Symmetry: C2
Subunit: 151 residues, 2 copies
């Protein structure tokens, strides 16, 4: 696949549409999310594209290389760690990321997995408690969607 899309929905007002495109050897992530509180929100690819229990059955971060959580720029990060998206005054976050670890095919493929937008800022694995090394203290899953093949 060269293009993927994900529609984020949850139990509150958070909603959004993320597009994924393979450009060269990398993947470009674009889109926008509305209904968010102002500030940073953890944005990650969770392992399972299972929405049987809402965002909860999405499991933990996609991590085929079995590393600890980190920011998008660290070496020690989960493949699913895309950092934070930032909502403005109006609750709108515009997504514009380029990432070297996720893919739309092969072992690092995120097609069929779940994009999750979190309630709090991701601390990038530097919070200092065990939880930081797992989820960055990003908190609850406000909205999520299964990543599908797009036209």
């Amino acid at each position: 696949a060269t293009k993927a899309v994900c529609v984020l929905k949850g139990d509150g007002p958070v909603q959004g549409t993320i597009h994924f495109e393979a450009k060269g050897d990398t993947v470009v992530v674009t889109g926008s999310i509305t209904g968010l509180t102002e500030g940073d929100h953890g944005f990650h690819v969770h392992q399972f594209g299972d929405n049987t229990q809402g965002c909860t059955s999405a499991g933990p971060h996609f991590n085929p290389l079995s590393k600890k959580h980190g920011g998008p720029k660290d070496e020690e990060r989960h493949v699913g760690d895309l950092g934070n998206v930032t909502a403005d005054k109006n609750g709108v976050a515009i997504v514009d990321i380029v990432d070297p670890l996720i893919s739309l095919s092969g072992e690092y493929s995120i097609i069929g997995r779940t994009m999750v937008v979190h309630e709090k800022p991701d601390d990038l694995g530097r919070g200092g408690n065990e939880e930081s090394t797992k989820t960055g203290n990003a908190g609850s899953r406000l909205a999520c969607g299964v990543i599908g093949i797009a036209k």
Copy 2:
């Protein structure tokens, strides 16, 4: 990828959870759909896992081999043609399908595509008209969901 799951949702009362498991060279499809009118309903894998416009953005049946519409037991069928599911008087259809053409990996992989349950019975390509050979005359998309990787 040996297991997948799909949660079907739409704008009406139809809902369901479909599970997929690779067994030998086949995919075993199980689950249930509720809120359906009694009788047969076409059940197919549509090409895109794009839910930006509901079930409509899912595109047509998944047909990598450029064949016409048929029933699951036909040689001339789309890879996404799984036939019909049957809802009882209470509106519940129990799904139990074994299929050798769809797959959870490789070229015919349905991971990231869309499972759709339709309003009318699928005529299996034997309706006598032209639509019969494209869609089985299954009617509207009652509920759909993106097929994701399951634990």
